[PDB]
Amino acid sequence: TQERKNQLINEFKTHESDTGSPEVQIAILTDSINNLNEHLRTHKKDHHSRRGLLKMVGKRRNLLTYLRNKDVTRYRELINKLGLR
RNA sequence: CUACCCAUGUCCAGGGUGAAGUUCAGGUAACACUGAAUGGAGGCCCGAACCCACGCACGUUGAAAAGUGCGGGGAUGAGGU
RNA sequence: CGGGACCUAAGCCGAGGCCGAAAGGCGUAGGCGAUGGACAACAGGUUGAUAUUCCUGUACCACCUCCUCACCAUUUGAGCA
RNA sequence: GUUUCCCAAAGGCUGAGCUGUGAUGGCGAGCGCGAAGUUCCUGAUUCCACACUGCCAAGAAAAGCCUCU
RNA sequence: AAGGAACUCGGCAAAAUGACCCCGUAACUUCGGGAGAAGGGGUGCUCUGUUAGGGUGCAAGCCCGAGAGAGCCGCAGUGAAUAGGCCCAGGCGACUGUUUAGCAAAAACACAGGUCUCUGCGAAGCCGUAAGGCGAAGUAUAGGGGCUGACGCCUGCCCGGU
RNA sequence: UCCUAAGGUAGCGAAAUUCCUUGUCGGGUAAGUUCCGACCCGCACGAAAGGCGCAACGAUCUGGGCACUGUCUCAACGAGAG
RNA sequence: AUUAGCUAGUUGGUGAGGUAACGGCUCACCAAGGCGACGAUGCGUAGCCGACCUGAGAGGGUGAUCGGCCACACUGGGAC
RNA sequence: UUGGGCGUAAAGGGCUCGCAGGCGGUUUCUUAAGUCUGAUGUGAAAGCCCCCGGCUCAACCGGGGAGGGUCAUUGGAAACUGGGGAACUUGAGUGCAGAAGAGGAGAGUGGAAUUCCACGUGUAGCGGUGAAAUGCGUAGAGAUGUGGAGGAACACCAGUGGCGAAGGCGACUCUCUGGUCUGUAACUGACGCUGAGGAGCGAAAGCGUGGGGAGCGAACAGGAUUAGAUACCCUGGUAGUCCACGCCGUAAACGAUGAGUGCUAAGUGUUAGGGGGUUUCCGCCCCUUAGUGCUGCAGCUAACGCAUUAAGCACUCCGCCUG
């Protein structure tokens, strides 16, 4: 957050100004989840943080299913950079 | 002797039964979960030694001032000495 | 080896001291007390009775130099513990 | 005993057995004498050994020992 | 032999069942069980086999013997000895445990859990007229005492007398 | 309507309690003073002297059915020990 | 769907036999598949169809007679 | 279906995250599964139906024809739908720059007030009602002064005010965390909407284990009230509420309105922005996104009412109703 995003926008540059480019957006969401997942292990009785997690799981499942039907190799190599299954 | 108790060594043929785990596979965002294998817990089961007296029979100037005979209940723990 | 001159728990005996209707339970110190720990040895004969003891073989165990060889050192002076 | 660095296999303590001796013996079926005296298989309740792992009820002491002054 | 509980306080006694492999298993259930429920089936010998296969070994050979096909035998085929009788309900005790040495093994005691209360540490309680060192090399998530008995649903009324 | 300090609620009920009794009504049997199912004119059930229901358990304890049987009508014979 | 799990000759292969004929149709072997929320398996129900009746049509009900076909011949099984 | 509904008449799931299934922005190439259409083959006959003829007409019977098929083959059509290939950026998302917040969870922090208790001071009652009694009191209450424990609730701000999807959340501060809205344009190039089962949340009551229990308070008790009072009133009063953790998963879980997309007069406040017009201003005025309320036109409605936050006109999806 605000320093890793400075790294990860620079990470998945297919073009130089890729501020969308959902392969960038997955890199925003995955480490947002791992920074959210370890909050749930601190606090289980919190529930109004998990409403965010279900959207962030739901947004990430949307962007992966998009890449299956356009970019076969790019979807594959993105998982290889993340290990997400 | 016995009743518990204190320190101390010691014994219990084999078979069954299979949890908590574990790992792998699947599964899930991830834990829940699922299936295999493994692992082997139990005042767990069946049954000898060994304890123990329930049920009849025998005994009752008995083999014996409490037994033997044919079978019976526990038998890795609140155990037996 | 089995038990002593090895140790020790359970428990007991217990200098003083705890200044107890007389006695007397016995209090640490200290030491008893083994079923424990510690420890050097077996394998073959043998009579009418003993046998990891007698005998024949073959070993170790601590202890001691009448000694022989070594090495180190007699005051940082080896060695003992 | 802790506390800092330096190396991550070596070392030690351990041991059931194994083989060589021990055996130029002693036993040994058999008639005081004495032959061959191997290999394979089975296989523990004894040994490594409370050694390992696991569980929970949290499983003596002191002296031989070894070391320090 | 025929008969099966008519015997009898009562299936007391006695027979009947047992072995291992394989198929199959109800109600209820606290999901662990119940269950080996029940209910039946095949087991011997000889040949395909020093077997399929394993162990073991360097091979040689030894042990382990899966399934079938074949076929012979008697009435029988764990032939001997010897190792569960099962099913339906019912109270009472939850349970394994313990006592009436030497009449009476349970429906009694114990039991986990519940629970009200005492007790601030030289605790309370106890031994018993002192000590001393149990409780405890413990400290209210601990230790005595009483009342019930796992778990599940529950535990209402009366403070007048004691 | 008198009397109490207060008058038994939940669940069970001829009960290991129940006298009259073998209560009555139903299944079990040709026949069932025991046993199970329900009835409540609970003599004298009742909530930690605990109340009820409970799968697993017992050399407990009552009742029923199969299997098989000298237990019995109805005795018989054989071995052995007196 | 107040029936969600069901099947081991089941489902596959190979060969064999068998049938006028294809085949697990039968058997050996080897493999573990197949069937399923588009509703399997199960259960209750019932012969189907051109057509009949009704409705304005879309549909709904019935499947008698006459015409098509299957199944059955007291109940069940086999075979010439 | 052609040929209904859902504010109150029977009916919106409490709300979400979503697999399967359902539906698709714009431009262009292509394909022909759907679709359109020819040809061929066929849907026997009787019957219906078109038209004749026969029986004394009719009924009946006969002749001819049509019709009946989500049919098959074959050949055409390419707009729309499905499929494939390629572009555009408004839908949706990302960056970046802002702004609002009682959104959640955590450990801690106070301030009045209730009671309790210690004590001074102080005397006959206070306490309570429709009236009064029970309760409390010469053992010193009530009132009053300081001090002490302890819990739970968090005035004022407070507002058809904020935010969350709903239930819901108001002392304070910190740590941790969700979404929201504006500003564009930097990016992606339709990546979206809805969603049976499935998953998670879900006030109060209740449940199990402990913690804590000051007020408050079912059950019960007492005093009245009353013909009766198992009630309203009355003084007490157990569980509870409270906390951590686990479960139940229901309500008028209400906007009695299922979620999204566009469109359709206004006027008006009000919460957060943004743009401008003279102005540093304050301010006024105007444009503009977003919830938030009220009065209103067309139309909808059986009437009340609803009206850019629809119950208007349309469409995609899910649930529900048939006295």
Going by C-alpha positions, the residue among A61, A63, A1 that lies closest to residue A32 is A1
Give nucleotides in strand H with any atom < 7 A to a protein C-beta.
16-19, 93-96, 103-106, 164-167, 176-179, 186-188, 190-192, 200-202, 244-246
Locate A54 and state its tokens: 């279900």
DSSP letter at A81 equals: T
CA angle A75/A80/A82 to nearest 5° reads 95
How is A15-61 classified by DSSP, letter by letter? STT-SS-THHHHHHHHHHHHHHHHHHHH-SS--TTHHHHHHHHHHHH
Experimental technique used to determine this entry:
cryo-EM
Q: Is A2 exposed, middle or buried (0-12, 13-18, 19+ CB in 10 A)?
A: exposed
N residues, chain A: 85
CA A29/CA A53 separation, integer angstroms: 10
Local structure of A85: helix, strand or coil: coil
Using left for φ > 0, alpha for ψ between -120 and 50, and beta otherwise, residue A21 falls in left
Locate A56 and state its tokens: 């962030």
Answer yes or no: are the C-beta atoms of A74 and A80 closer than 8 Å: no
